[PDB]
Amino acid sequence: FLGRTGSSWFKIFLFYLIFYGCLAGIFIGTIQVLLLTLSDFEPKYQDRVAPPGLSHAPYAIKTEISFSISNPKSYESFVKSMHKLMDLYNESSQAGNSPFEDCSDTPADYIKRGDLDDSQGQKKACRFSRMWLKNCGYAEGKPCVVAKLNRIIGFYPKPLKNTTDLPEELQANYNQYVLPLRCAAREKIGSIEYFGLGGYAGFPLQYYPYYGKRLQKKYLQPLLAIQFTNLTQNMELRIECKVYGENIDYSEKDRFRGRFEVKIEVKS
Amino acid sequence: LDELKKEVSMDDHKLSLDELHNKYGTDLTRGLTNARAKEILARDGPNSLTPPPTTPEWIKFCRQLFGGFSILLWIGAILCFLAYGIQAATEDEPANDNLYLGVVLSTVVIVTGCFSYYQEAKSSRIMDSFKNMVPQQALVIRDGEKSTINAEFVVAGDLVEVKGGDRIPADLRIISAHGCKVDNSSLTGESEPQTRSPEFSSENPLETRNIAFFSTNCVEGTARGVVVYTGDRTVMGRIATLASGLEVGRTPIAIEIEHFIHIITGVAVFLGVSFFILSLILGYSWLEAVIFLIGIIVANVPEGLLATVTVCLTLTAKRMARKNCLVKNLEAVETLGSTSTICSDKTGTLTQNRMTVAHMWFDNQIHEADTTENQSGAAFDKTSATWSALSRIAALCNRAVFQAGQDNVPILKRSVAGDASESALLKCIELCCGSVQGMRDRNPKIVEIPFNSTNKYQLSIHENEKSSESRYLLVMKGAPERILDRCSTILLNGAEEPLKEDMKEAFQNAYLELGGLGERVLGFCHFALPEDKYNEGYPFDADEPNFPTTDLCFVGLMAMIDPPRAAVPDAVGKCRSAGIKVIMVTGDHPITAKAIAKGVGIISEGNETIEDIAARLNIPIGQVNPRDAKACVVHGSDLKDLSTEVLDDILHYHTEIVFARTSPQQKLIIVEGCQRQGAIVAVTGDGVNDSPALKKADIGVAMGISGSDVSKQAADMILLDDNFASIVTGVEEGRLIFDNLKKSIAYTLTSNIPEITPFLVFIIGNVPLPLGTVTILCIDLGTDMVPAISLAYEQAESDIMKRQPRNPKTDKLVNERLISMAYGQIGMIQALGGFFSYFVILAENGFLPMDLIGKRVRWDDRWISDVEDSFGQQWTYEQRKIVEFTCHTSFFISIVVVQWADLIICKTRRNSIFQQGMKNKILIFGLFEETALAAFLSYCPGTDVALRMYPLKPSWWFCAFPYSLIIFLYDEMRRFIIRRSPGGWVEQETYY
Amino acid sequence: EGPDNDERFTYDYYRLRVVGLIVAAVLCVIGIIILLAGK
Ligand SMILES: *[C@@H]1O[C@H](CO)[C@@H](O[C@@H]2O[C@H](CO)[C@@H](O)[C@H](O)[C@H]2NC(C)=O)[C@H](O)[C@H]1NC(C)=O
Ligand SMILES: CC(C)CCC[C@@H](C)[C@H]1CC[C@H]2[C@@H]3CC=C4C[C@@H](O)CC[C@]4(C)[C@H]3CC[C@]12C
Ligand SMILES: *[C@@H]1O[C@H](CO)[C@@H](O)[C@H](O)[C@H]1NC(C)=O
Ligand SMILES: [K+]
Ligand SMILES: [K+]
Ligand SMILES: [K+]
Ligand SMILES: [Mg+2]
């Protein structure tokens, strides 16, 4: 033929069949032992998610949400993702004492449901009403963005203490139980309005620590609705929403490390 | 074009002096007119040689920039700029990826260009050396007056004059001469002075006395002649053009390189476009379809391989430089290993090029002297009183002297003023009797008759050094038979005795044997003149026989020859044991050529020519079956009337071939004949008459000390110490580097698979990219470099000089067996070890292997800063990318770890590491430096930006260890099978 | 610890780099030693 005879062509096939078969069987074996060394409830390493990311619902083309108020299908793209998220926070999804629980309607302290063990059933998560998100189809004019803190197993988000000076200096400082979120731009051509649990501009600490998908399915993380009823129009406004805390940090590279990058433009 | 120049020349030495003048419109006495000479100048053109048109270095450099790998790397470099252009227009990408990768790849092409350019070097100044043989000026007779003119202004027809010490300015017809002798070594390779006279003495113009040639010099006397040829039209000017004009051609090693380039280029374009369409079918945007292709290019092309080859060659050439063997062309480092036929000059190559005493006949006994340079033999006789009598004649009846200031150099190497035979005798006595000058001071010469054409003897009368005599001793030497007709007694073991027919017959026997050995034989005799008949003041007349020259006492015979170099016989046998055919090709006479052939082992004992059979059986040569003769001796005059097909039959039908009295073109023809049969041929030589053959040879080797400038220009290799044993070393080195290149190539190729497979699974699996493009270049250009080079220092696995020369048609540098092992077996194991570490990194950070399938869409989505892992955690864009790049880093390090084992297995093709050992210190160096480089690239701060290399946790380093070990075991088991059964299965499938 | 389990999300990449570079250097020196056993 090309290389060899039929007899040789066969033998080279019988070899590579057994050979690659063995190699596949060995590869799988090493994957088995790897998995055997891992927990079902907690990942081996968590230093790469460490400082929590802050992500929002409006799917930004490039950290930007520009549209026209005087146009219907101009914002119907951002309403798709906005709906996708809030559709999960339905009351019909949170039914019965299992696996949900009514928690303080005001920001409270942490809740420990034991260890990362299966020695108990599904760890009961705090309910969250999308109805706590006042004012927010969504904002056809002047968007109503929804913030979110990235989930990390066993992470206890710790707010800053009012020992020294603060950006939003001491205003509504629920020091003990709220992780604040203050959006900014100089360039003050807007109108910041925050909505959340208990009416506070933060995340209620009663939703922590997260026990993971395996130990807490259907779990709901707290949301923080933000509305920009800015009196300006037809210009790119670089708005940055920042979260503050002891366990919260940022990076010049990762522009989502505990903060937002939104470029709103109501070009109408 | 040069087929005309490969033919024997035609001449006009047969014409009379007068007749020759009519042909050139010339005067025998007055010479040309100033006006007629200038007319002929403009007519024929200058008496000069024009160098052939060369290829500029520009085109030579750029021709390498387009050879398979460079072509693919160019397509990659441009395709980078393509994707970059498409980006800069569509979505403003502030990145530098495609732009920088395009710059990097273009640089890789340029630098790789320098390496191949360095390897494909051609240092040739043939025509320049020939031009150096034309004198600046010549002496001509114009308008009846002699004047010096620019030799280029010399034309056919003018009257030229030459004298001892000057170069022949052009081909001349001798019309007048006085004691003129010439050095024709340019045409023959033999430096013994040849007389020139107006008389025609041979039909063959290269042998007649009435022609003098350009490229030669007058050694003594004076001559006048008419110019018959000028410039390019001279006999050796044509040889110049032939030699300088010959197409170089591709080396065996070069052909091998291009061959695997085709193979690897083939699989590259195959998988390249095979997966380019496979991606579009899967619905991949052309934006991405090209990005994957660039990666495929980089994965398939072994970026550092061609440069490795060059370095391995260079390092092999450095070792040979250290044995006095200079390599002018890097590729010639290997040709000697692939050589199946050596065509060797005799004089100054196989031989020392110096008349040396070989045997002596005295006391009715043949004695042998030591002919070797360094005198590696033993003594023959010292005791016999006869010896001292013969020794005295050899010293006394000798007019040769050592040049001043030689006392530092060895006797046999020092320059001597005199003819070759007298120098030989001088050096013979000086060696075994001490200072000859002393013997010539103790015995003052009073009268002598120098060797005469008519007398055929030379005699001398000396004052006997003996005090009790202080009388007159007569000594003489000459033609053995002439000396015999002048002897009455023979000095036997001390005492004289009558010359009976018995001893006279033993003389003839001794004389015939020595002459049969191709040796020049001389007779020696002396006579103690009677005291009473010769007073202490008796005057001797040299002009008229004033003393007896008959009834003298015969002392002995001495024989001499230009002997082989000490190492030559043994080197010839070694070449022949390695299955290399050795042919002699010489300008010298057949009797001498044949005798040295037997001396060095070109013609082995018992082997006969058709002429030998005929003489032994006493029958006509036509009655001899030529197939009964494995040896042959072909004279150039017969070679001339043979067609190439008939030359091919001679080459095919004889194992032991001697081509004697060959011209320079004839040497070229013999070389081409050998090549025509498909053989790789080496030429060894030292003369300008070797230049065409040396050029045409697959590898020409010139002698460094004895070699002429031309020969060393025409060669690929120079033996700087004239050590012929270096050929044996060269062939051995050549074979070793050929095997080691295979090892180094397999090693380099093996790591291509773990660079290809990640890109494929990226498409078919939709998982995060396991390894990056930049990461690949860190391997092929970084870590694999020193290890790959180090394989050039591997010792032989067996006695390589015991095997036959490779068949260049069947035995390839890269074959299917190499690809099967490197791509199908070992590289495949490396790929898995890479993937394993990849799955380990991701799974330990929260992305278990199961959830990875079909996630790249969301993984690469820059706007999703919340991807969910297996444990329900959310990752931003840059966070997961850090883990991904950490995966690139550990996959990279996994390659390094699996290349550890590969380096050790590529060490040997057959033998076990437990047999070959770990005595390669460069290899071990490679292991340490490779690992140091990898660690540095991972842990050095800032490398995460420039190369996207991230720090690895200690446990990460050990992921591929079980795969590294399986490689070592697998290959060790496999080679154990090879050795345990030379049959073929494992052998014919995987044996590189 | 409980709410004070910050060490769980931390890794000393600084020490690892220091050690990694020490090792790389020493492997580089060791290599020179073995190579220079004859040049
Ligand atoms: C989650 O809540 C949303 C609230 O808008 C539900 O949307 C409803 O969709 C139905 C049918 O398309 C409409 O008739 C209603 O007007 C919507 N709102 C309400 C309050 O009922 C959505 O269907 C819910 N999703 C799930 C899975 O239950
Ligand atoms: C990533 C995976 C799926 C690709 C696997 C590719 C396999 C099938 C390839 C890789 C190397 C290949 C072999 C390389 C060498 C030879 C020897 C030659 O004389 C005949 C073909 C043969 C035997 C090839 C057959 C196919 C082969 C085994
Ligand atoms: C939000 O909606 C409420 C009614 O639910 C209305 O009273 C109020 O004006 C709205 N706020 C703004 C800022 O438009
Ligand atoms: K490669
Ligand atoms: K050559
Ligand atoms: K490679
Ligand atoms: Mg010679």
Side-chain angles (χ1 to χ4, degrees), chain B residues 610-764:
Chain B
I610 43 161
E611 303 78 14
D612 294 326
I613 311 284
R616 201 192 80 222
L617 270 47
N618 186 30
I619 60 179
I621 289 168
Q623 194 177 321
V624 175
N625 191 354
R627 302 291 65 84
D628 291 1
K630 295 266 66 184
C632 63
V633 173
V634 177
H635 194 284
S637 279
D638 308 332
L639 210 188
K640 159 186 59 64
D641 297 303
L642 301 174
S643 79
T644 38
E645 303 67 44
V646 157
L647 301 170
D648 279 293
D649 279 303
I650 286 156
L651 274 28
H652 280 162
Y653 292 149
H654 304 84
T655 53
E656 307 195 331
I657 306 181
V658 178
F659 287 104
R661 211 61 184 168
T662 53
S663 67
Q665 322 90 286
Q666 280 178 327
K667 301 202 175 203
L668 174 56
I669 288 164
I670 293 145
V671 161
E672 285 192 357
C674 297
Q675 291 171 327
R676 205 155 54 235
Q677 326 278 47
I680 305 305
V681 327
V683 172
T684 52
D686 72 322
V688 327
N689 68 319
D690 294 328
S691 59
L694 283 165
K695 225 307 207 309
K696 191 64 177 59
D698 298 284
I699 168 153
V701 185
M703 306 291 278
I705 311 166
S706 96
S708 64
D709 188 48
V710 179
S711 67
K712 47 183 65 170
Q713 294 297 314
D716 303 297
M717 215 165 84
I718 313 300
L719 310 183
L720 300 170
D721 57 353
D722 289 1
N723 179 214
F724 208 87
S726 292
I727 285 93
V728 175
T729 311
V731 53
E732 186 172 330
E733 283 290 318
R735 293 178 185 199
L736 196 40
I737 191 55
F738 191 83
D739 288 344
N740 294 352
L741 281 181
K742 287 183 169 172
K743 307 188 165 169
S744 167
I745 291 167
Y747 171 85
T748 301
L749 289 183
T750 298
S751 60
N752 274 1
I753 304 306
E755 298 159 352
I756 296 160
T757 48
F759 275 82
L760 311 180
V761 184
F762 180 64
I763 322 298
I764 308 297

Side-chain angles (χ1 to χ4, degrees), chain B residues 82-259:
Chain B
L82 166 73
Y84 180 76
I86 304 298
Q87 281 173 191
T90 312
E91 299 301 300
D92 175 64
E93 298 290 306
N96 312 302
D97 293 51
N98 308 303
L99 184 64
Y100 276 53
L101 186 58
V103 171
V104 171
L105 285 178
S106 66
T107 294
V108 173
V109 183
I110 298 166
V111 303
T112 309
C114 296
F115 269 103
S116 65
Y117 174 67
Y118 181 82
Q119 194 183 305
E120 299 255 302
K122 286 180 280 190
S123 176
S124 188
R125 281 179 52 179
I126 305 304
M127 187 57 81
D128 271 332
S129 274
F130 273 96
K131 284 179 80 58
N132 290 307
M133 286 180 277
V134 40
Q136 198 73 27
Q137 298 205 318
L139 191 67
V140 303
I141 317 280
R142 283 170 188 183
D143 286 17
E145 214 47 77
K146 65 171 78 186
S147 52
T148 55
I149 63 169
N150 184 330
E152 306 201 330
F153 292 158
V154 164
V155 293
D158 46 21
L159 197 46
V160 155
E161 184 179 290
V162 300
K163 56 168 186 175
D166 57 30
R167 299 174 165 278
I168 309 300
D171 289 352
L172 317 176
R173 206 300 192 188
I174 310 287
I175 64 159
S176 199
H178 188 256
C180 185
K181 283 197 176 197
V182 98
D183 181 338
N184 287 332
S185 76
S186 266
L187 320 94
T188 65
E190 304 292 323
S191 63
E192 93 157 51
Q194 302 295 299
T195 13
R196 301 287 84 153
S197 64
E199 174 196 52
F200 138 85
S201 65
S202 201
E203 315 297 17
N204 181 335
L206 300 188
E207 296 278 20
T208 187
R209 292 188 170 191
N210 60 345
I211 306 291
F213 305 91
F214 147 78
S215 92
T216 71
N217 41 95
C218 180
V219 136
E220 66 195 76
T222 191
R224 222 122 98 160
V226 181
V227 187
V228 295
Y229 293 128
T230 264
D232 290 354
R233 294 157 306 292
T234 70
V235 174
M236 298 301 282
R238 289 160 69 96
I239 300 304
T241 314
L242 185 55
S244 320
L246 284 171
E247 291 286 310
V248 193
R250 277 137 35 185
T251 65
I253 221 318
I255 291 178
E256 300 302 323
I257 308 306
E258 301 183 348
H259 181 258

Side-chain angles (χ1 to χ4, degrees), chain B residues 297-304 748 751-752 755 776-777 780:
Chain B
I297 305 301
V298 177
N300 280 268
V301 171
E303 289 84 18
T748 301
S751 60
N752 274 1
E755 298 159 352
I776 302 170
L777 301 171
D780 289 52

Side-chain angles (χ1 to χ4, degrees), chain B residues 447-520:
Chain B
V447 193
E448 68 170 356
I449 299 169
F451 192 85
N452 287 3
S453 184
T454 170
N455 282 123
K456 212 75 171 194
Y457 74 79
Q458 173 166 298
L459 67 75
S460 269
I461 308 155
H462 304 250
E463 291 186 315
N464 203 311
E465 73 208 83
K466 188 184 177 192
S467 302
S468 301
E469 277 188 313
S470 187
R471 199 236 294 99
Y472 295 141
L473 177 61
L474 171 62
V475 297
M476 71 151 70
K477 80 191 197 302
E481 60 289 334
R482 290 292 221 296
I483 301 304
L484 205 280
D485 297 313
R486 294 190 178 272
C487 299
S488 58
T489 45
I490 303 177
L491 208 148
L492 175 73
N493 208 201
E496 294 188 31
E497 65 179 35
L499 212 178
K500 60 267 187 72
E501 192 193 50
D502 186 59
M503 286 290 279
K504 193 174 286 182
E505 196 157 308
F507 165 88
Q508 278 299 321
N509 286 213
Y511 183 37
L512 281 174
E513 186 182 331
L514 299 173
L517 271 34
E519 304 180 359
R520 191 193 292 166

